[PDB]
């Protein structure tokens, strides 16, 4: 239904706007106005979407189709509309009952009352399918429909019959009757319930009402002497100024037609209670409210700093590199570090400092955490398969840590997160400075989600993981290390891990991280591609090529 | 930014609502009111989200992470805000320039004018950091800030000085000055630009203004005799009734403070041009508008009929079945048909008639269409691989039609849709009654998307595809058929195809379709599971078991 309700709103607003446009033009240039019946077109326009006419002029293998969650939109849209119509229906009925009450309590007029009405309407031979009644229960005129078109006038106006107030009242309310405004109002009012999903129904009923009163004024002017026009306007003002103003009913017409500013102001004057409120009233409210604002300040807010990249300086000595030739077709950034010299070597430092979600490379942390916490071990580095198929054929099997890491088997790693107390992981994120340390709410929060780290930070953290972390065992450090070997020669053993930030089928994060153990030094590094085809494989190739050219993988 | 703008709106509305609540209570029960300065808290509340304080109390394998398209939300939210603030800034400046003009055009008062102001404010020793000016360019009082708090009074009120209008005007505007309302208004006004993303800024400036006028009224009552209270209210009305009403400025205070209904009505009376507009004006507009409504009727609308299942009768003779034992754990529906008898056999007909997207089973139509149209053939039943990895390991290869169909290789089939003129496909959807024949906009529209078909329709269409379709070659019919063989014995050859409606990792459509060629008859069928584990594999198992029990796969 949500789509239909929306389409209805669109249809409605289209027509509605066109009419507003015309309304403007007609008055602005010609002193012309719309015949309000035209507004029925907006209602009709919004009913169009609901008219059912096609009018115009073996091997079991499968993938996951990612559709929008419409159930959570249409189930609620349906309910929202239903509840509201019930509420509005009640409001309507309440108003209806009011009208019925008055109908029951309506009084008949005698010949010395009826003749005033006749005097007023007679000259234009207005129709007799109208009802005039009086009452002791009202302060100012009220119209009613009932197929009768009743004008109920407070009985006091049958005493105050020497100031022409009735002339204006009757012609005014009469005009509404003439044009069946009350009825039409009711019809629209009913439709405002039916079509309550579209707030413009209220907007238009209001505009209609405003204009209905205007047309009535036009009528009255047509029915009065030019030298009484001023009087009429004054009368209109008196009809509101001298009375209490309440929306006692939303169906009938009356002088007090809207929640105006004057309404509020004038009532306050009538209720001239010149009491100075205690200063403490607002001291309390203001501080209370302030504290409630504080409560809002106790809650989630954003920070430009969080959105930002490593804005921090590097505390270590470093050199800036130019490796743009190697990045070539896949622009990015790169960080290398020398353990012996405590020196960093950074390509495009501004970019090196940019934080990206780790993707699959985080799995080394996830797995090694499981190892230290005694969740995952060597004898039991393995995880059971749930027999659910996964994204690569390579993943549809049981596996140990070396296999799981080598083939990036997400299943293996999903279970590892589930099997490790989250607080263990959170503790390590904090202790070893894991980028923004943002664990999100996702068990695999690093997988193109909430946790982000720069290449510089990635190098710092891994290096410290082995070099400094005193809250992590030697076995976990080494067991993990062996699973990452890429290549080796007479100078070194190169270790690392790739991952691809692939989202909605496109590449966004070309990750490759690692370290090198050589026969002269130890190096740490991180590569990230953002442009071209920023895949994990390209990052691997790029990193190796760089490290070799820089002497890391070539003896210098 | 969208998230922040939203958070701001939320923060704002929270506080705002609390204040509205208090406002209600204070007046409703005590005749007390908020000190409008409190509304600064809503502005502050909406600024909170922007405060950057973390306050509270290798083998390359990868999968696709399906994230929400925030770029299309934040890029626009940013622009929307920027454009609007520019517009509002202009509007502000326009208002500012107006005020500057008046400042430049302000006139000084002489001693016989100044003494009136003094008479009015003197008794309460009101401060002199106020400016009184007069002008020939205005009709009613206007306030200005400039750090001066200027009250500009039309020069005519210095002639009409024997009716106490000034008493009320000055005290009223003075009160606004006393409380620095103009300034605060301006500040809020400036913030309504800054925080324009939140429409409540306008709501509150309005509420503030309304209440500012109220506080001024309270002040005035505090500063006048009780027997003048009535006069004051009348004066307020005169200050609007007897003047043109225009929002000449949105910063200054004036008598004509809002776009009221009375405003509109009274102007219309002043402009008492009693011209009957031609009837043709609205005949045109109404019909035009109608035709524009028709234009909306020329457009997309929904149909309950489209949303509905096969509401149609079956034109063929049939028997209703009870196979609930076999469905068992995976409730659904099932249709079988006898070619010799022209009879249908239907389990849960109400459910059999339900339409579901075909999933991978549609591929038989897609492929056979390619065959007839001479896009795909036998010698060239094959399709090249684009070297992109696909959802199953089974799919990461080149393939012919038999392999592609047997392993559901979506890639193969995606290319087939791309290689077949869409009109060929559309023609066949129409000619052979393919369910709702809805081709969507998706090249693979049948894959848990727009095309839907019932099991009954699935049986009818496939049967007719071979039995009746005279716009489709024999080779395409048979080539496709061979690729579907499941099993055979001394009575028959069973053919078919599965597919699984898996969405966001869950099973929704357990499809299996097919036919049986026996040594006595020919049968057609379609199975669909909706409950339990409605997988394509279960559908295959269920269908076979049913067909055998029914005699289809067992000689009867
Ligand atoms: Zn009226
Ligand atoms: Zn004022």
Numbering used by the authors:
A (entry chain A), B (entry chain B): 1 to 57, 87 to 585
Copy the relevant paper text.
As in S. aureus and E. coli, BlaR1(WT) expressed in L. lactis undergoes spontaneous autocleavage between residues Ser283 and Phe284 (confirmed by Edman N-terminal sequencing), which was mitigated by mutation of Phe284 in the P1′ position to alanine (BlaR1(F284A)). The structures of BlaR1(WT) and BlaR1(F284A) (the latter alone and in complex with ampicillin) were determined using cryo-electron microscopy (cryo-EM) to nominal resolutions of 3.8–4.6 Å. The BlaR1(F284A) structure (refined with C2 symmetry) exhibited less variability and the sensor domains adopt a position slightly closer to the membrane compared with BlaR1(WT). In the BlaR1(WT) dataset, the sensor domains were observed to be dynamic and are able to adopt different orientations with respect to each other and the transmembrane domains. A comparison with BlaR1(F284A) shows that the sensor domains are positioned at different distances to the transmembrane domain in order of BlaR1(WT), BlaR1(F284A) and BlaR1(F284A)–ampicillin. In the BlaR1(F284A) mutant structures, the autocleavage loop is intact; however, in the BlaR1(WT) structure, we detected a mixture of uncleaved and cleaved forms, the latter with the central P1′ Phe284 slightly shifted in position. Although we observed the same binding orientation in the autocleavage-deficient BlaR1(F284A) structure, the P1′ alanine mutant leads to the loss of the close van der Waals-driven socketing of the aromatic phenylalanine side chain into the S1′ pocket, preventing productive coordination of the carbonyl oxygen to the zinc. The F284A mutation results in an unoccupied S1′ pocket and associated movement of Tyr261 on helix α8 towards His201 of the HEXXH motif in b (orange) and c (cyan; dashed line). The strain containing BlaR1(F284A) (blaR1(F284A)-blaI) displayed intermediate growth attenuation in presence of nafcillin compared with either wild-type BlaR1 (blaR1-blaI) or the functionally defective BlaR1 (null) (blaR1(null)-blaI), showing that the F284A mutant is partially functional.
BlaR1 and MecR1 are membrane proteins with an N-terminal zinc metalloprotease domain and a C-terminal extracellular β-lactam-binding sensor domain. β-Lactam binding to the extracellular BlaR1 sensor domain regulates BlaI cleavage by the zinc metalloprotease domain in the cytoplasm. BlaR1 forms a domain-swapped dimer, with the zinc metalloprotease active site accessible from the cytoplasm. BlaR1 undergoes spontaneous autocleavage in cis between Ser283 and Phe284 and we describe the catalytic mechanism and specificity underlying the self and BlaI cleavage.
